[PDB]
Amino acid sequence: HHHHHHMKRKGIILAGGSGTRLHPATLAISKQLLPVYDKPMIYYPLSTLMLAGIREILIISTPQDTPRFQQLLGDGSNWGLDLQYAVQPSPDGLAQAFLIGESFIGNDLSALVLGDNLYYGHDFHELLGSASQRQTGASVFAYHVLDPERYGVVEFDQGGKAISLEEKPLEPKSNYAVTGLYFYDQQVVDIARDLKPSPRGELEITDVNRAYLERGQLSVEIMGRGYAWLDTGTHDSLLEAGQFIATLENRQGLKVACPEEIAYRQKWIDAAQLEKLAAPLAKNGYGQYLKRLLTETVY
Amino acid sequence: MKRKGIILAGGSGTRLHPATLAISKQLLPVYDKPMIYYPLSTLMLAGIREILIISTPQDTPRFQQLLGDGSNWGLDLQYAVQPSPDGLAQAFLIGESFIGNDLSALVLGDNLYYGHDFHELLGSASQRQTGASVFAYHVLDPERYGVVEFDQGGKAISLEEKPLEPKSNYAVTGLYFYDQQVVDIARDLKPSPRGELEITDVNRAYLERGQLSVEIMGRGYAWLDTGTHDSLLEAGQFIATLENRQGLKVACPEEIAYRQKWIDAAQLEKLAAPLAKNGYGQYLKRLLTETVY
Amino acid sequence: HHHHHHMKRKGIILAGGSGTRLHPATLAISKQLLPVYDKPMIYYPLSTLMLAGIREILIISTPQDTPRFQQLLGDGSNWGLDLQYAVQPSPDGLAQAFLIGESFIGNDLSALVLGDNLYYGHDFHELLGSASQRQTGASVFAYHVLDPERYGVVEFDQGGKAISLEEKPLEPKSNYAVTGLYFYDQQVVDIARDLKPSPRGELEITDVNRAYLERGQLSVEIMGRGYAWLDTGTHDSLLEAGQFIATLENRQGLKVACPEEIAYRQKWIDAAQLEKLAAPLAKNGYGQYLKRLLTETVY
Amino acid sequence: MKRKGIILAGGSGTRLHPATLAISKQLLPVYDKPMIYYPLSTLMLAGIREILIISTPQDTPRFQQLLGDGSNWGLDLQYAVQPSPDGLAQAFLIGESFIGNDLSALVLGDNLYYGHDFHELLGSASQRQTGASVFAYHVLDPERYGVVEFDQGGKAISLEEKPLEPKSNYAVTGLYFYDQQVVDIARDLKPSPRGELEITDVNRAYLERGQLSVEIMGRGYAWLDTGTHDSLLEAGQFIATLENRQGLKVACPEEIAYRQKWIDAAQLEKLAAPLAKNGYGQYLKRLLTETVY
Numbered sequence A, C: 001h002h003h004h005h006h007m008k009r010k011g012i013i014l015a016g017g018s019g020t021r022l023h024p025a026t027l028a029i030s031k032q033l034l035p036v037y038d039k040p041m042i043y044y045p046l047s048t049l050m051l052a053g054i055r056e057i058l059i060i061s062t063p064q065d066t067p068r069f070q071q072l073l074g075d076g077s078n079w080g081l082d083l084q085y086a087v088q089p090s091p092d093g094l095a096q097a098f099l100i101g102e103s104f105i106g107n108d109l110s111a112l113v114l115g116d117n118l119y120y121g122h123d124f125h126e127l128l129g130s131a132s133q134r135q136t137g138a139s140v141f142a143y144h145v146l147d148p149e150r151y152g153v154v155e156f157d158q159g160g161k162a163i164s165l166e167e168k169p170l171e172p173k174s175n176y177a178v179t180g181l182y183f184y185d186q187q188v189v190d191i192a193r194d195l196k197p198s199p200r201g202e203l204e205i206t207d208v209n210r211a212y213l214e215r216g217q218l219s220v221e222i223m224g225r226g227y228a229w230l231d232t233g234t235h236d237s238l239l240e241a242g243q244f245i246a247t248l249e250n251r252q253g254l255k256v257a258c259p260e261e262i263a264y265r266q267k268w269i270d271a272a273q274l275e276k277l278a279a280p281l282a283k284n285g286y287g288q289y290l291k292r293l294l295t296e297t298v299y
Numbered sequence B, D: 001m002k003r004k005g006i007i008l009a010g011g012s013g014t015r016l017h018p019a020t021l022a023i024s025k026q027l028l029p030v031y032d033k034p035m036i037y038y039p040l041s042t043l044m045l046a047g048i049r050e051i052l053i054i055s056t057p058q059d060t061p062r063f064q065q066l067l068g069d070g071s072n073w074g075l076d077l078q079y080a081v082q083p084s085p086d087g088l089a090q091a092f093l094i095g096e097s098f099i100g101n102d103l104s105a106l107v108l109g110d111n112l113y114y115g116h117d118f119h120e121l122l123g124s125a126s127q128r129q130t131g132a133s134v135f136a137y138h139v140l141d142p143e144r145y146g147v148v149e150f151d152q153g154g155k156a157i158s159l160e161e162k163p164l165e166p167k168s169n170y171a172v173t174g175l176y177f178y179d180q181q182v183v184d185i186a187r188d189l190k191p192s193p194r195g196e197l198e199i200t201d202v203n204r205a206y207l208e209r210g211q212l213s214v215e216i217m218g219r220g221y222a223w224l225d226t227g228t229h230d231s232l233l234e235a236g237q238f239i240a241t242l243e244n245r246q247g248l249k250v251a252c253p254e255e256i257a258y259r260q261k262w263i264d265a266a267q268l269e270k271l272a273a274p275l276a277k278n279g280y281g282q283y284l285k286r287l288l289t290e291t292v293y
């Protein structure tokens, strides 16, 4: 039949099971609800999508913990967002987010962020700007790491063009890891639908990204060393993430990834609504911070 | 006499929100294990196997799911709820049927202890059949706690809850040992001006009868602060540093049960299986074939 | 007499006495020789000047510790720099750097950096670019902090224009502190020469900066929240700086403020010289890092 | 008999360069005080007042300038140099005239100890008039140290320096107590295959004669690692966390002298004056008017 065209990207946060890897610390609750310093882990990737201009977001979690995410985040109306929820009853790979989220995505562009990924740095809005404005193909970011063998790894030719992707190579071609933020056009659901499980029994995002690379439609932007990309894969790195955020916030008197603040600065909520959000937390430092936002110019 | 244990892992208000909006803080990790493993381990080191866990109504199933009936660790665990956070002394009303005619010990669910000869420091406390025992610890900020005043001879002469002008820098820690009088003492308490049933009022009732032993927990012990986001982080880094230096874990309940002979090598081996692919199960397996002094 | 004109900025690092403030930790050696994680504190501001394109640099320190800085840094030839040394026998204020450094500066533009100031973030080169290219007036940077009362504080009007500077105000007009990096034109020595000591008995850099502000020649650029500016004023903040750097380096496998690296990337030293510098440290991680630089492309 | 102390604060090679290019690492701070305050404090807690500080030729004046002749802290300090880092046992050759006919104790200048009843753990070691005493501590990485092997009955039966296949996870810590035999034992040592005069060879000489006491330093003690940039940082954060929780300092020599009655209140007051405007002098002044148990 005839369609009519007259595009506005949706977000997905994958906040499912990290298995038994961090047990016993994660036996009672999902990793993405653990605090990083002063706020739940999922605030950080949520703030990243909000900074990209994305207001319609799907949170994917385990059946057990979906109510906890819903109690925390609600339907998003308090922050000028619309949040929906889906369950992932078995952790079958990152690319499953597109099958789980097929009806949510519909015919729109999308962005996937991992619920345990934290980003920090200057001009990040503009880094997210470039990817968000590409209405065709896929956009990912590459970041120099110590241990690229843990990640999807990008190989560049002498001219700096991305030429191959390898998932967890034993002998990485570079130290550039693909970060856990991915922008896709309308092709991604069909690409994901045709994936077959890897030997590990997982639907791999690296295979989705290679499909775009083979089409000549993968943009790989470098996220430079002046940004911090942290992912909280071990108890040690979780502690380090906490200390990192605390050092920054206590130095600056500003918070990293405060969703209320980002919504207020994006003009998705106004002063009066921000005042209402501050009221219940008025006796703790978080509520006091929200109140200070109303009567301070921050450049 | 038998001494039963109680862990009070109740509601911390909105003080650490939004970090604790989704889950009570005693279920959050300090480094590599749930916070509640630490006070549970303190009770187990004191020789206590029958333990009541008190939490909010919402989070009890999460404590029940986490720890079970205790049989896997040679423990006998029970659960109860504190509907509203109306004072630590409420633990003894909630736990009255659990305690019965036995001796008791209460530990706060967010308190972490570290140091040498803790098994022996708890032992002296545990073996007193009469009176109550508490521990006093020198802190920077005594006004946050129950504060002990001593006379020139070193005798405890008063207790004040959150004094505006503290009489000393010695705070009462979150571990309390009680004889058979405590339930009856708790039952006669009235709410404070702040509206709570105060453990300090329980402790003063013992003090007035000369039945409160206040032992100093020395500066060589760590009693770690988890009252702020800052202190939470510091405690994690503290545990991290010790464990990574030593290759030994702090407050591993499976290990403590094994060393107490509450479970045998065959049971420890079964416990190590599920987590065999990560650091915790690996640690438990190594316990079977290493002598640790 | 007649002059002839046919400009190339010099750097000064003030690494003098921080008095008895951090005693006993600093009784045996200067604060600016204390390590921040894996390298001496002074590497960080030195790297900042190098990133600004500055190769001719004066290090000002106490008479007692000048030999220690000289043993560490030499005459700079190893890194494609020219380093000179001057002493500050009494800590009489930051603005004294221009009197001490008068002959060194000569008729050139200059930049002053505090020897205990660390900077980190994306596009910092370009932030330093704007200030370095202003051949007239002065340039400073303002950074939102928790405790502006400890600093020189900038007041902005509703349009964002800097309108006043106050040194350690009890009731700060804003939370924007002036950071410890200052760019000056040829007027600064004369401005400094005419300063009188403040009530505290110090020649104040805030007075130098106000002189420029009153002339309409002070540029105040915002250093945004996506940058880290740390200054190591307490034992606590020193520890935090150390942890911050360690988290970044161990995540990335890249070093912050490695002068050898910056000189190599600026083409002030070539591959062969970098190889020579790596040789003496070849058995430790620092030397191994220098060696890796030669056979890796870092974007 | 009198027991004299030695702190070996010698050269650490190029291992932590460039961080330590300008100054030896034992003069760098761990949090709020020079690293050497920590092992110095360990000797003072052991009751030792006559102490020889051994350092590189370049940095001795910096140790001399820092600590003086010790008279301000009720100590008797002397200095000597180790020209080349050719083994820890060289301390006994360098210190031979200092030691004379007395008992001795050696502590490494980069070793930090924390825990309860340390004064008493050093006391038992200090009061043995014959033989040698060392402490063994469970670590993650025994291959970095002198490693102790025990038989099934718990008896130390061998020592190996940096074994490729360690026999246990028990490392010998950097505190050693010796009788009058050690100088003569050190004098007869030959360099190892690695070219050093090994303290482990000294300790094995005592072991062969059944005169080596190997006491376990339990997991409730912290023996902190300052061998890497990472472990340096961890130690600082460790001290920070304790001191900020307690409002008491770890290894404050002025405080320890005061408590040992080696200096009186009038002397402590004079010591507090110079630093009266910062946290350290403030701490010292507060010591005059607070009872700390």
Ligand SMILES: CCCCn1c(N)c(NC2CCCC2)c(=O)[nH]c1=O
Pocket: A044, A047, A048, A051, A119, A120, A121, A124, A125, A255, A256, A257, A258, A261, A262, A265, A266
């Ligand atoms: C729309 C204006 C947003 C300004 N902003 C911002 N960019 C960030 N950056 C953080 C967010 C994701 C981590 C980088 C932040 O944490 N808080 C903010 O208020």
Ligand SMILES: CCCCn1c(N)c(NC2CCCC2)c(=O)[nH]c1=O
Pocket: B041, B042, B045, B113, B114, B115, B118, B119, B249, B250, B251, B252, B255, B256, B259, B260, D220
């Ligand atoms: C019955 C033998 C138990 C020995 N033990 C022990 N004492 C502790 N320490 C305690 C002291 C600080 C809280 C943990 C521990 O964490 N794990 C153990 O296995």
Ligand SMILES: CCCCn1c(N)c(NC2CCCC2)c(=O)[nH]c1=O
Pocket: C044, C047, C048, C051, C119, C120, C121, C124, C125, C255, C256, C257, C258, C261, C262, C265, C266
């Ligand atoms: C000329 C190319 C330099 C690239 N670079 C760089 N910009 C920094 N940024 C750091 C330096 C001052 C702290 C920000 C660094 O630490 N190491 C580097 O190699």
Ligand SMILES: CCCCn1c(N)c(NC2CCCC2)c(=O)[nH]c1=O
Pocket: B220, D041, D042, D045, D113, D114, D115, D118, D119, D249, D250, D251, D252, D255, D256, D259, D260
């Ligand atoms: C003679 C009474 C001394 C009491 N004392 C003491 N034991 C220590 N602890 C020691 C144990 C860890 C190294 C510091 C300390 O740091 N400061 C002190 O004043």
Ligand SMILES: [Cl-]
Pocket: A223, A224, A225, A226, A227, C121, C122, C123
């Ligand atoms: Cl960058």
Ligand SMILES: [Cl-]
Pocket: B217, B218, B219, B220, B221, D115, D116, D117
């Ligand atoms: Cl103690």
Ligand SMILES: [Cl-]
Pocket: A121, A122, A123, C223, C224, C225, C226, C227
């Ligand atoms: Cl920014």
Ligand SMILES: [Cl-]
Pocket: B115, B116, B117, D217, D218, D219, D220, D221
């Ligand atoms: Cl112990």
